[PDB]
């Protein structure tokens, strides 16, 4: 769940094995890499189910997105964020999980 490079102008990315529980000890990363001038919008779809924590926001299981100097996240819980207009052709996503719990993860679609 590392190394993927997405170069088509639309696509779908999910947590490993979605909608089944994601693996424990996940250290996943993904890149969307389109031609300069393209502008990617990210929209979560379907169920969103990332373990949360009572003491800190999204410490150990989380998704985070970066485009240029902009970072969105970390996100977790049972509700996705609203769609993200990245204003970029170059997007980095990472997804972490720890060794406990049994949550189903995430699905997002991207378009440019
Ligand atoms: Ca691991
Ligand atoms: Ca967990």
From Swiss-Prot:
CUB domain residues: 1-112
Q: Which cysteines are joined by disulfide bonds?
A: 1-28, 58-76
Where are the membrane-spanning stretches? none
User: Binding of Ca(2+) 3: at which residues?
Assistant: 51, 61, 98, 100
Report what the protein is called: Mannan-binding lectin serine protease 1 heavy chain
């Amino acid at each position: 769940c590392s190394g993927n490079l997405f170069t088509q102008r639309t696509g779908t990315i999910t947590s490993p094995d979605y909608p089944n529980p994601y693996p424990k000890s996940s250290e996943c990363s993904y890149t969307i890499d389109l031609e300069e001038g393209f502008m990617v919008t990210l929209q979560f779809e379907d169920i969103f189910d990332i373990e949360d924590h009572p003491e800190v926001p999204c410490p150990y299981d989380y998704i985070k997105i970066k485009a240029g100097s902009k970072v969105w996240g970390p996100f977790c819980g049972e509700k996705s964020p609203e769609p993200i207009s990245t204003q970029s052709h170059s997007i980095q996503i990472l997804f972490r999980s720890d060794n406990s719990g049994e949550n189903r993860g995430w699905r997002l679609s991207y378009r440019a």
